[PDB]
């Protein structure tokens, strides 16, 4: 038996395992649903991006009430490195108030100031070449970017020429250059920091930078292709776990730990381990005849993602080359693959279908004329309307406090609620960063191979549609600006210039929004128990000893940004909290 068992070898588990195994007297077992990736081009080479090699299979949503009852495929990782292995490598910190908010929901410690040292420790930033910084308008604040930590990030070493048109158009419609989107604000446009190792121009995922890097260590055990099926207890103490093969062979095995269990199975996996282990809402557990160890009705409640919209265009006069050239021009593709293989230059340094720059905006940057009308509607409506009738009152009090903090962010000029992106090809992306809508993930049985019922409940809160429609309109501004007009863009079916009203435009969005960018979070939320929280400030699950949540299940709510950089830094942080309590080197 081992000092610690970690359930899941994604960003959080692997980061924690690495730091705990720094004390050679400490032994760790990481059990991970997925295999080791085979170093295949679709993982390591940006231009080869093929996320679908390591998607969890047979995961489908309920009909989505907010999105014309559409049923969508659920995307999450099943592989050592979890999401970092298969993600678009977008490496962005939240805004200051994201972390200050978490502290103000009743979590001592938590702030931008307490998270800043861990973001720095987490990483090594490699500067781009000076000719690319100057030509690309790449800027950073060296003072707040790590130089010693394991996660490599940098930028591609190429941009598509059209990314210049987009930058100037974004500038032209109120989205200015951001000095460093990693400094706690990101109001305008910047280069996407990418989680790439610039020595090789290859993905820097948790498996390389928090396992291969330290895999010489005897005390750092990994077991790929196995599920944690249950937590094992002596009374209220978690002592070990049962594990089964992922492929569904008739085999169960108990392993035990001397100190703690850490759950790290992500937003769609950690709640399931708790519910099967009898840590969940009493009503769900009773209905299934699971003995109740800890009545926590917040387990599987409060699911959030960051919805996506793909807006199709045609161009009379698009500049060559662009991202779509890699698909349609076999010659261009081969010349750039040859150029990557030889001298590690060119289009293959960029994640396939993305560009190098991006915009983020606050509510009042998106909608300078109407943001007060949106806030008013939000402040008018009671928090309880967002949740099913019958929702536990502690869960409702928690959402109400999230909702209040999010409404202040709506008022804040320096907090993002949306992302705009153009790949330089036939589509643009608009991300809803801060939805007020709340979903569920609940086990349907006691069979640990069974999919949990996943209900995103995207667009159930009608304030989300007003925010999203503002985001859509600002994107349209960029494409209609002078610097993008010379390319002759026009919205393709089922959008178009012929949709002018909030209702015409959102009717289409309703049909097209993806509930998910696989940023599933918050389904075991770090708030007080009397506000429907599952974990304390030190990430300990309520009413049980020696069990914490490390994965982004613990987040109260979605950042102004994508989760990956906080997943790393949060795990770096929990690592110090555990070493503190049990006295390790
Ligand atoms: C395709 C795609 C693309 C993106 C992203 C995700 C995906 C799927 N994301 C999201 C981001 O990668 C994700 O939110 C983080 O990896 C979350 O880290 P965790 O440690 O919470 O989960 P993560 O998913 O990393 O780890 C959970 C692990 O637990 C395992 N598991 C589940 N149940 C288990 C069980 N019972 N037993 C054992 N193991 C179990 C899974 O196999 C998985 O590997 C992203 N973010 C970002 O910042 N930039 C981006 O560009 C993207 N893009
Ligand atoms: C990726 O991250 C690591 C961590 O900073 C870098 O590895 C260090 O590199 C220097 C010079 O190569 C060595 O002398 C150190 O011993 C290495 N490890 C450390 C400080 O932990 C690596 O340089 C980074 N990749 C890039 C492109 O810079
Ligand atoms: C979605 O299905 C439900 C039946 O459960 C029904 O109330 C509703 O009308 C449907 N909505 C749409 C827009 O199809
Ligand atoms: C860089 O910004 C300058 C304005 O400072 C502008 O002239 C140029 O077109 C921009 N190019 C890109 C690639 O963003
Ligand atoms: C697995 O094996 C045990 C004993 O060999 C038995 O209780 C059980 O029915 C088997 N299960 C399946 C699904 O075959
Ligand atoms: C295709 O790409 C090659 C290589 O860069 C280029 O010479 C050619 O002009 C392109 N052809 C078309 C039709 O885009
Ligand atoms: C800016 O691009 C992204 O954040 C992103 C793009 C594509 C995918 C994969 N479906 C995921 C994330
Ligand atoms: Mg240099
Ligand atoms: Na270069």
Distance from residue 251's CA to the centre of ligand 5 (Å): 8
Distance from residue 271's CA to the centre of ligand 5 (Å): 26
- C-alpha to C-alpha distance for 404 and 314, rounded to whole angstroms: 41
Smallest Cα–Cα separation from 570: which of 204, 264, 172, 278? 264
Buried residues in 64-78 as b, exposed as e (16+ CB within 10 A): bebbeebebebbbbb
- C-alpha to C-alpha distance for 300 and 283, rounded to whole angstroms: 13
- C-alpha to C-alpha distance for 210 and 8, rounded to whole angstroms: 13
Question: Computed from CA positions of residues 166, 167, 169, 174, in that sequence, does the dihedral angle turn out positive or negative?
Answer: positive
- C-alpha to C-alpha distance for 233 and 235, rounded to whole angstroms: 6
- C-alpha to C-alpha distance for 66 and 453, rounded to whole angstroms: 17
Smallest Cα–Cα separation from 229: which of 219, 239, 242? 242
How determined?
Answer: X-ray
Question: Computed from CA positions of residues 88, 220, 569, 126, in that sequence, does the dihedral angle turn out positive or negative?
Answer: negative
**Quick check: 494 and 309 in contact, CB under 8 A?**
no
Give how far the C-alpha of residue 402 lies from the chain's centroid of Cα atoms, to the nearest Å.
Answer: 18
Q: Decide: 356 in ligand 7 pocket, CB within 6 A.
A: no
Q: Count H helices, E strands: the chain?
A: 19, 21
Helix H, strand E, coil C: the string for 99-161 is HHHHHHCCCCCCCHHHHHHHHHHCEEECCCCHHHHHHHCCCCCHHHCCECCCEEEECCCCCCC
Q: Decide: 168 in ligand 4 pocket, CB within 6 A.
A: yes
Helical pair 96-104 and 393-411, crossing angle rounded to 10 deg = 150
Ligand 1 pocket mutation, candidates 83, 231, 246, 304, criterion most atoms within 8 A of CB: 83
- Tokens 């069979």 -> residue: 447
| CA-closest residue to ligand 7 atom 6 | 88
- C-alpha to C-alpha distance for 120 and 359, rounded to whole angstroms: 23
The tokens for 558 are 């979605």
What are the φ and ψ backbone dihedral angles of 284, each rounded to 5 degrees? Answer: -65, -50
| CA-closest residue to ligand 6 atom 12 | 329
Ligand 3 pocket mutation, candidates 61, 67, 69, 455, criterion most atoms within 8 A of CB: 69
Q: Decide: 90 in ligand 7 pocket, CB within 6 A.
A: yes
Q: What is the DSSP letter of 53?
A: G
Q: Decide: 71 in ligand 3 pocket, CB within 6 A.
A: no
Helix or strand (DSSP H, E) at 163: helix 162-172
Query: What residue spans of 266-392 are helical by DSSP H?
Result: 266-276, 282-288, 325-328, 330-343, 363-366, 371-380
Geometric angle at alpha carbon 237, from 233 and 240, rounded to 5°: 50
**Do the strands 123-125 and 151-153 form a parallel or antiparallel pair, or are they unpaired?**
parallel
**Which ligand has its closest atom nearest to the C-alpha of 191?**
4
Question: How many CB atoms are located within 10 Å of the residue 3 CB?
Answer: 19
Largest CA distance in the chain: 70
Cβ-proximal residues to 115 (8 Å cutoff; 6+ apart), any chain: 99, 566, 569, 570, 573
Q: Decide: 148 in ligand 6 pocket, CB within 6 A.
A: no
Q: Which residues pair with 17 in a beta bridge?
A: none
**Measuring CA to CA, how many Å separate 353 from each of 25, 87, 152?**
46, 13, 22
Distance from residue 264's CA to the centre of ligand 1 (Å): 9
**Quick check: 76 and 520 in contact, CB under 8 A?**
yes
Buried residues in 248-281 as b, exposed as e (16+ CB within 10 A): eeeeeeebebeebbbbbbbbbbbbbbbbbbbbbb
The tokens for 561 are 């940004």
Helix or strand (DSSP H, E) at 170: helix 162-172
- Tokens 């914490």 -> residue: 548
Question: Computed from CA positions of residues 295, 297, 300, 306, in that sequence, does the dihedral angle turn out positive or negative?
Answer: negative
Question: Computed from CA positions of residues 331, 335, 340, 344, in that sequence, does the dihedral angle turn out positive or negative?
Answer: negative
Q: Decide: 68 in ligand 3 pocket, CB within 6 A.
A: yes
Torsion of CA 251, 256, 261, 267, to 10 degrees: 0
The tokens for 61 are 């949503």
Q: What is the DSSP letter of 179?
A: S
**Which ligand has its closest atom nearest to the C-alpha of 198?**
2
**Measuring CA to CA, how many Å separate 150 from each of 22, 119, 195, 204, 209?**
13, 11, 11, 9, 5
Cβ-proximal residues to 482 (8 Å cutoff; 6+ apart), any chain: 168, 169, 172
- Tokens 């196995």 -> residue: 226
| CA-closest residue to ligand 4 atom 5 | 137
Name all domains of the chain by residue range, CATH numbers in brackets.
2-215+302-582 (3.50.50.60)
Q: Decide: 31 in ligand 1 pocket, CB within 6 A.
A: yes
What are the φ and ψ backbone dihedral angles of 74, each rounded to 5 degrees? Answer: -85, 130
Q: Decide: 338 in ligand 6 pocket, CB within 6 A.
A: no
Q: Decide: 88 in ligand 7 pocket, CB within 6 A.
A: yes
Helix H, strand E, coil C: the string for 495-543 is CCCCCCCHHHHHHHHHHHCECCCCCCECCCCECCHHHCCCECCCCEECC
Q: What is the resolution of this structure in A?
A: 2.2
Q: Decide: 167 in ligand 4 pocket, CB within 6 A.
A: yes
Helix or strand (DSSP H, E) at 229: strand 226-234
Smallest Cα–Cα separation from 319: which of 428, 475, 168, 424? 424
Geometric angle at alpha carbon 321, from 320 and 324, rounded to 5°: 105
């Amino acid at each position: 038996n081992y000092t610690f068992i970690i359930a899941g070898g994604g960003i959080s588990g692997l980061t924690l395992a690495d730091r705990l195994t720094e004390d050679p007297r400490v032994t760790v077992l990481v059990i991970e649903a997925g295999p080791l990736d085979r170093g295949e081009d679709g993982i390591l080479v940006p231009g080869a991006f093929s996320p679908w090699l390591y998607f969890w299979p047979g995961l489908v949503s309920t009909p989505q009430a907010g999105l014309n009852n559409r049923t969508v495929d659920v995307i999450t990782a099943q592989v050592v490195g979890g999401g970092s292995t298969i993600n678009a490598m977008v490496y962005l910190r939240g805004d200051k108030d994201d972390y200050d908010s978490w502290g103000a929901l009743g979590n001592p410690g938590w702030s931008w100031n307490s998270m800043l040292p861990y973001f720095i420790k987490s990483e090594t930033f490699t500067p781009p070449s000076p000719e690319l910084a100057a030509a690309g308008n790449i800027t950073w604040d060296g003072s707040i970017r790590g130089r010693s930590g394991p996660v490599n990030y940098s930028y591609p070493n190429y941009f598509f020429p059209g990314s210049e048109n987009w930058w100037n158009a974004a500038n032209e419609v109120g989205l200015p250059p951001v000095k460093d989107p990693m400094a706690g604000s990101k109001q305008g446009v910047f280069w996407i920091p990418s989680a790439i190792d610039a020595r090789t121009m290859t993905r820097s995922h948790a498996r390389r930078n928090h396992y291969d890097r330290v895999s010489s260590r005897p005390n750092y055990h990994i077991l790929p292709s196995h599920l944690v099926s249950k937590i094992l207890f002596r009374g209220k103490q978690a002592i070990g776990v049962s594990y089964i093969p992922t492929s569904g062979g008739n085999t169960t095995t108990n392993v035990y730990a001397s100190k703690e269990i850490t759950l790290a199975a992500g937003g769609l996996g950690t709640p399931k381990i708790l519910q099967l282990s009898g840590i969940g809402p009493r009503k769900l557990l009773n209905e299934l005849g699971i003995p109740v160890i800890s009545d926590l009705p917040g387990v599987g409640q409060n699911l959030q993602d960051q919805p996506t919209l793909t807006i199709p265009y045609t161009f009379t006069n698009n500049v060559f080359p662009n991202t779509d050239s890699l698909t349609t021009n076999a010659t261009y593709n081969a010349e750039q693959r040859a150029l990557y293989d030889s001298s590690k230059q060119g289009a293959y340094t960029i994640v396939n279908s993305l560009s190098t720059n991006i915009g983020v905006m606050s509510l009042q940057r998106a909608a300078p004329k109407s943001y007060r009308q949106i806030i008013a509607a939000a402040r008018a409506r009671s928090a309880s309307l967002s949740l099913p009738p019958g929702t536990d009152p502690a869960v409702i009090r928690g959402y109400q406090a999230q909702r209040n903090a999010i409404l202040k962010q709506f008022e804040n000029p320096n907090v993002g609620v949306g992302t705009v992106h153009w790949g330089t090809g036939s589509s643009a992306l608009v991300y809803h960063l801060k939805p007020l809508s709340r979903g569920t993930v609940n086990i349907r049985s006691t069979n640990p191979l069974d999919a949990p019922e996943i209900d995103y409940r995207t667009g159930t809160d009608p304030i989300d549609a007003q925010v999203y429609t503002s985001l859509f309109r600002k994107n349209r501004e960029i494409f209609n600006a002078p610097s993008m007009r010379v390319l002759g863009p026009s919205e393709a079916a089922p959008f178009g210039a012929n949709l002018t009203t909030d209702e015409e435009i959102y009717a289409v969005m309703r049909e097209l929004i993806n509930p998910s960018n696989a940023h599933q979070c918050c389904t075991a939320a770090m708030m007080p128990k009397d506000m429907g929280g599952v974990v304390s400030s030190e990430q300990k699950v309520y009413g049980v000893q020696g069990l914490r949540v490390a994965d982004i299940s613990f987040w109260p709510f979605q950042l102004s940004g994508s989760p990956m950089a906080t997943a790393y830094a949060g795990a770096e942080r929990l690592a110090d909290v555990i070493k503190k309590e049990h006295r390790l080197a």
